Structures are given as structure tokens and as C-alpha cells.
Amino acid sequence: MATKAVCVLKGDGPVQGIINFEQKESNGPVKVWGSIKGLTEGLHGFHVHEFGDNTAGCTSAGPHFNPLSRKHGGPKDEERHVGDLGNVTADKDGVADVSIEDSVISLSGDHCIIGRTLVVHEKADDLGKGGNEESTKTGNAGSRLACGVIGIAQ
Amino acid sequence: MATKAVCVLKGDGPVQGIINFEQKESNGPVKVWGSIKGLTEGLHGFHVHEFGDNTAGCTSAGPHFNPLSRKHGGPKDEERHVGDLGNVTADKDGVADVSIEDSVISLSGDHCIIGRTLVVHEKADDLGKGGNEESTKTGNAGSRLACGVIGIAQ
Numbered sequence: 001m002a003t004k005a006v007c008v009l010k011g012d013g014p015v016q017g018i019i020n021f022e023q024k025e026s027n028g029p030v031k032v033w034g035s036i037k038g039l040t041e042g043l044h045g046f047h048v049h050e051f052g053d054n055t056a057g058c059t060s061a062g063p064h065f066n067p068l069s070r071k072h073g074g075p076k077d078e079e080r081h082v083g084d085l086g087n088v089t090a091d092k093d094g095v096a097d098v099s100i101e102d103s104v105i106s107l108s109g110d111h112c113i114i115g116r117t118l119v120v121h122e123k124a125d126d127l128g129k130g131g132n133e134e135s136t137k138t139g140n141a142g143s144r145l146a147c148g149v150i151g152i153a154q
Numbered sequence: 155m156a157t158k159a160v161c162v163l164k165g166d167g168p169v170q171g172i173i174n175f176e177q178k179e180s181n182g183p184v185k186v187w188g189s190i191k192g193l194t195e196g197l198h199g200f201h202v203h204e205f206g207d208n209t210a211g212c213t214s215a216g217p218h219f220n221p222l223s224r225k226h227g228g229p230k231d232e233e234r235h236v237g238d239l240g241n242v243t244a245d246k247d248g249v250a251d252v253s254i255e256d257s258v259i260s261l262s263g264d265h266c267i268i269g270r271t272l273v274v275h276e277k278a279d280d281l282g283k284g285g286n287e288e289s290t291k292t293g294n295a296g297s298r299l300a301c302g303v304i305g306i307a308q
């Protein structure tokens with residue numbers, strides 16, 4: 001049904017952004033693109049979380065969206081959360097230019113991410129390869145800097 | 155299979171609030187309740203708009219959600235937009251304690267309002283009885299005071 005979606009990211013700090021999603025075929029991949037500003041230079045975990053609940057800011061978004069009950073990985077791993085979109089990279093000006101294609105998320109059906117929350121994190125996602133409990137759950141990406149509900153777009 | 159949703163309404167003015175949605179059965183009504191502050195005493199149009207797109211504030215939400223291409227009505231009318239939830243009423247302190255039950259909106263299927271935008275309006279919705287062109291589109295409810303994307307809730 002939905003072929004386009006959009007998310008406005010905001011937080012308590014300076015991190016702000018707009019991410020676009022496009023899926024021209026229901027059984028095809030989703031392109032995810034846009035820009036995030038206000039970030040510290042370097043890598044930042046970038047995940048779809050389960051709830052589109054911003055009533056307590058990014059905290060009420062709950063955990064990584066994981067309907068298949070897998071362990072956390074990078075977006076190229078077979079073992080991954082549906083929500084695991086890896087890292088975005090901020091340049092020296094604090095701007096991350098996002099350009100991702102993904103085959104696991106969907107804008108329709110059981111992996112559908114409309115109505116869930118996109119979150120950019122304080123630290124790099126260790127892609128589930130950090131050798132501890134936390135790595136297998138969250139990637140050690142730490143704090144939530146900005147988030148927004150993924151909405152249907154024209 | 156969502157059975158709960160939530161929406162944080164924010165705007166450029168004093169209007170803000172949190173609205174909850176619950177739909178225990180997919181063939182059943184959706185209960186809509188919560189609290190919005192900052193509103194002038196009396197009736198305010200309360201609608202689901204088509205896009206969950208807050209890139210230009212409430213303007214980018216587009217028109218009332220209307221997948222059946224009907225004219226604007228009140229929620230008790232057969233001729234209504236899916237998104238036509240009617241009015242909410244703010245008391246003398248500016249508070250609307252919202253409590254609605256509606257069987258045309260849904261949290262799944264064709265009429266699913268997850269990922270769409272809830273908007274509270276400046277003026278009363280005339281429920282399509284205003285006799286002018288605008289009544290059949292917006293109910294003459296006027297500008298958008300606060301809005302948010304409807305998200306899946308726990």
C-alpha cells in the first residue's frame with residue numbers, strides 16, 4: 001500500500017534531520033535517504049525502534065524493532081533486528097548524508113515500519129560484534145540523540 | 155496487528171497534548187482519549203489527515219484522510235471522510251478531555267490511521283452542514299493548531 005514515508009528527527013539537543021523512505025515494489029527493497037545535522041563527527045547507530053511513542057521523548061520508543069526475535073547485527077548480516085540500519089557517518093561539520101538501500105525493512109506487511117520510531121544514537125553501533133551482552137541487544141550505540149515517528153508521505 | 159496507538163500533538167502556539175487510541179478487535183471501534191491544553195473554550199475540529207509528514211509543520215499533513223473520496227461529514231454520517239472525527243470541546247481552562255469512539259477509523263487494514271497525522275483545529279467543524287464549498291472539504295474548521303504523527307504504542 002504505502003510506497004513513500006518520511007521521518008522528522010528531533011531531540012533535546014541540536015541533532016535534527018529529515019529521512020525519506022521509498023519502496024516502489026511491495027516485495028522490493030526500501031531506499032532510505034536524507035540528512036541529519038548537529039552530530040559529533042564520526043559514526044552513529046541508526047535504528048528503527050518498536051514504538052512510535054514519543055510521550056517520554058526517545059525513551060518511550062522502546063527497543064530495536066525485532067519481530068523475528070533475532071540478535072542485533074549490522075544491516076548486511078542475516079542475523080539482525082528488522083530495525084538494524086547500521087551507522088550513519090557525520091562529517092567534520094556534524095552533517096550525516098544518509099543513503100541506504102535495505103531489503104529487510106518494508107513500508108507494508110509484517111516488517112512494516114510505518115508508525116514506528118527512527119532513532120539516531122550517541123555512539124557507533126558495533127554491529128553486534130563487540131563481545132558482550134549489550135552488543136547483542138543494542139550494538140553499544142548508547143544514548144538516543146533524536147527520533148521521530150515514521151509517517152506515510154505523498 | 156496493532157491494538158494501541160498514540161499521538162503527541164505539538165504546534166507553534168500554546169496547543170499541545172497526548173491522544174491515545176485503542177482497538178481491541180480489528181472489526182471493532184477505536185477508542186480515542188487523552189488531553190489537549192491551550193485551546194480556546196468550546197468546539198475544535200479534530201481530524202486524521204492523510205500524510206504523516208511533519209516536514210513543514212502541520213501543513214505537510216495534507217487533507218483529511220479520505221481513501222473513499224467522500225465529502226466531509228460528521229463522524230455519525232455515512233457520507234464522511236475516514237479521518238472525520240468531528241469536534242473536541244475545551245473547557246474554560248483551555249483543556250479538552252477527549253473521549254471519542256469511532257468505527258470508521260482503524261488501526262489496521264484499508265482505513266488504518268497509523269503513520270497518519272492527527273490535527274486539532276482553530277474553529278468548530280460544522281460537520282459538513284455549513285452550505286458552502288469549504289464545508290464539504292474541511293467543515294470550515296480553519297487553521298491547524300497542533301498535530302503529530304500517529305504511532306504504534308505498547
Ligand SMILES: [Zn+2]
Pocket residue numbers: 047064071072073080081083084137138139
Ligand atoms: Zn538491533
Ligand SMILES: [Zn+2]
Pocket residue numbers: 201218225226227234235237238291292293
Ligand atoms: Zn473531512
